[PDB]
Amino acid sequence: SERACMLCGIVQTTNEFNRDGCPNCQGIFEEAGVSTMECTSPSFEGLVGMCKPTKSWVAKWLSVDHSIAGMYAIKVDGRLPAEVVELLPHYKPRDGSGSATIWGVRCRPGKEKELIRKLLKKKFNLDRAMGKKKLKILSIFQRDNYTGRIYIEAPKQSVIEKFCNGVPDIYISQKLLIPVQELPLLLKPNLE
Amino acid sequence: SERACMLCGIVQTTNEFNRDGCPNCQGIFEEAGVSTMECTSPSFEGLVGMCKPTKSWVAKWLSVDHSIAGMYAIKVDGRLPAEVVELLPHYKPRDGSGSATIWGVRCRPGKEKELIRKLLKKKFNLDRAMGKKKLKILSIFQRDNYTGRIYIEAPKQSVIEKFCNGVPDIYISQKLLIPVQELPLLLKPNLE
Ligand SMILES: [Zn+2]
Ligand SMILES: [Zn+2]
């Protein structure tokens, strides 16, 4: 009789979703023209008693930090209806899919920061020049401790190659999709 | 001449902060009665060319996903003025401090989900009964694959012991502060 909301992750009984809808997402569901029930799933895992959403790091990582105190699920199986998804650019699936795709690209040691500056400017100029469809470069970054590499967030290898073509000091043919298990060590504020 | 905003992480020249303030945080700084300059730091690391904040996982993890496209820093040294901090419950320091404190607590195998339900209810009842100062229990959670343990987010060991006292099936004297490097494997939607 328990179900979890695919948008916010909240766990309530079927009766509660039927009576009250979702305490977090109801406005969005109303605008989407969808029922709360079809936005919920009977299949979920990882119960979270969320007591202080504004302070909790768990809440931050699960995107429940702007949601109400209550019971949440870490993993919710199922696909949110398209009419909800099209309203929410920030939506990221709670089933594990739609994941981080970050590519480590080899570059000339000592040029890492310079390259981030140059490529950010390049993307800005491409957006100004191109039409409706932009190059899907989401972000680019470097870490001082990881010399000779820059990191490019983009869904496909082809996009990065298209983006880096003709740019000096980028060794575009030497790249690696960073495994998820390596990502935390990559973006933690204090390294080593 | 470059500085990074301690609140949003944005990197701009001193001149740019002087002219335009912070494009993200100026409203908050105005309400706080503080200058933009004293909310910025000359000491920062990890340049991020942020191109698509609403879509980027990097942006999500750095809390720049609701900020403007631009250059950001992963680590910003320095202390945000108190009059800014007191306005923002969601504020988490960009220097590495104010970190996730999650305790793995041993429990009777098979009672994990039950305990999350019971403890969430306990905290709710304590908030209703207690005065201004509440028990600093931020969240509690379990993972199906990690049997015989529950996880409690709280700043101090004493708080957890106070919270779990007299609760059956919790083995409160057997606990461990989870190292940061183990946290990603703990909260990832799909385990093993
Ligand atoms: Zn919801
Ligand atoms: Zn700012």
Curated annotation (Swiss-Prot), chains A, B:
One of its GO terms (cellular component) is rDNA heterochromatin. A zinc finger (C4-type) spans 5-25. It is found in: Nucleus; Chromosome, Centromere; Chromosome. It holds the Pfam family Spt4. GO terms for molecular function: protein-containing complex binding; rDNA binding; RNA polymerase II complex binding; zinc ion binding. Its main location: nucleus. Present with 4490 molecules/cell in log phase SD medium. The SPT4-SPT5 complex mediates both activation and inhibition of transcription elongation, and plays a role in pre-mRNA processing. The complex seems to be important for the stability of the RNA polymerase II elongation machinery on the chromatin template but not for the inherent ability of this machinery to translocate down the gene. Structural and functional component of the centromeric and heterochromatic loci linking chromatin structure with kinetochore function and gene silencing. This is Transcription elongation factor SPT4. It comes from Saccharomyces cerevisiae (strain ATCC 204508 / S288c). The gene is SPT4.
